[PDB]
Amino acid sequence: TKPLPALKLALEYIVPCMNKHGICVVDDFLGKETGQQIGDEVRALHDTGKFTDGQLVSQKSDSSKDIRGDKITWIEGKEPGCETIGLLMSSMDDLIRHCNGKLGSYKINGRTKAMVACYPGNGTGYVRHVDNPNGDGRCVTCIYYLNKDWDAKVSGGILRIFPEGKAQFADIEPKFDRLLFFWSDRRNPHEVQPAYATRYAITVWYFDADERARAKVKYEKGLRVELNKPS
Template sequence: MPFIEPLSDSDLERLALERFVPALHSHGFYYADGFLGELAGGAVLEQVTDMHRAGALQDGRLAGSVPSIHRRSIRGDKTAWVTGGERGCEAVGFLLNLIDKLVSACARGLQSKTIRERSMAMVACYPGNGTGYVKHVDNPNGDGRCITCIYYLNKDWTLADGGILRIFPEGKAYVADIQPLFDRLLLFWSDRRNPHQVQPSYSSRYAITVWYFDSAERAEAKRRHMIAKQQGSSSS
């Protein structure tokens, strides 16, 4: 669904309620093209590539160690975490503000979810050396993450560049292959409904990801963490 001009608040609400919410209910994911437009999207890309050139991106972390398996065989990206308020991240901050408005509008149509907070933004680059990210689930254990949002920044991307995000929707007889095209915004459920993988990338592949939290699940996850921490302290 391409847009020519920057999206207004009414555009965002209409996009959320007429496109994203129905698709999340029926398919578990949806993407829109032309989210920021050429000028603003280009400014975000410039800031992200500046971060990369400055060495601000570090090897992506794994949630847990896997004996005898090298990290790069699981995920090969380099990442940095930003709020959007940092110097040199003004365009990223503008993007995050629009995504916040979009997801806030989506939340009004997702009555089973109360979404009031999100993660910091993860700026990521797959450096084009054939690395990807193996099939995984963002939130397999109820940590509160509800919606994954990914904004792609790759101009003139072709199938030969690889880097497709492949989603394996739970209970569906198909997979969804999503190219990481410039100015494309993708939303999908973060839980076990959407296992996904990043296929090997053969050109530098840039994206910005944020996760939005379901308030009730997030509070319960924090409660479990505190109990586990207290039990660990009492047993030591």
């Protein structure tokens, strides 16, 4: 068992998969070691109180109906105690780079910072939605899962995706060391089923140069940073 080089994984799997299904799962992305360390950093961020109620971020008014029940924080990847999260990001960035020019007609010129989230279970999740419905510039959603030994049958927390105009849907378990890619626009409405155990995940959104430039000012979610370069 050996690591598939990014270029091969990108061109032989990710590109075809995305252009055909618009949804792509990559298991055993970084291996147990790196995976658990990312879990420790995230869990540490949580214990040291670095998260903020996700509901407060999305909501419009204080009377707005609950959209999400998670806690989050934005990580750039260089902050103290976030080095491994930074490695994750460089890894994601490396794959995207090899894909670039082969994912639809998109020209990916950057990404958002990493949105580290925690779903404290207790029936908390995220209601059905589209990440980028108004052309805010984000073309690909990338999510990395960190939940060691997860049984959706009793803990739930399944990510169910409904590809627009297709006779099928996708049920993604928030499996440890699993990386997920899917178009961020209306093609992928999705919902996070009720969770009953603490659930951690890290999301990065990649920008398309064209759509971003044509983006409305009206639209961290909007901050674009360059892909990481190999140290």
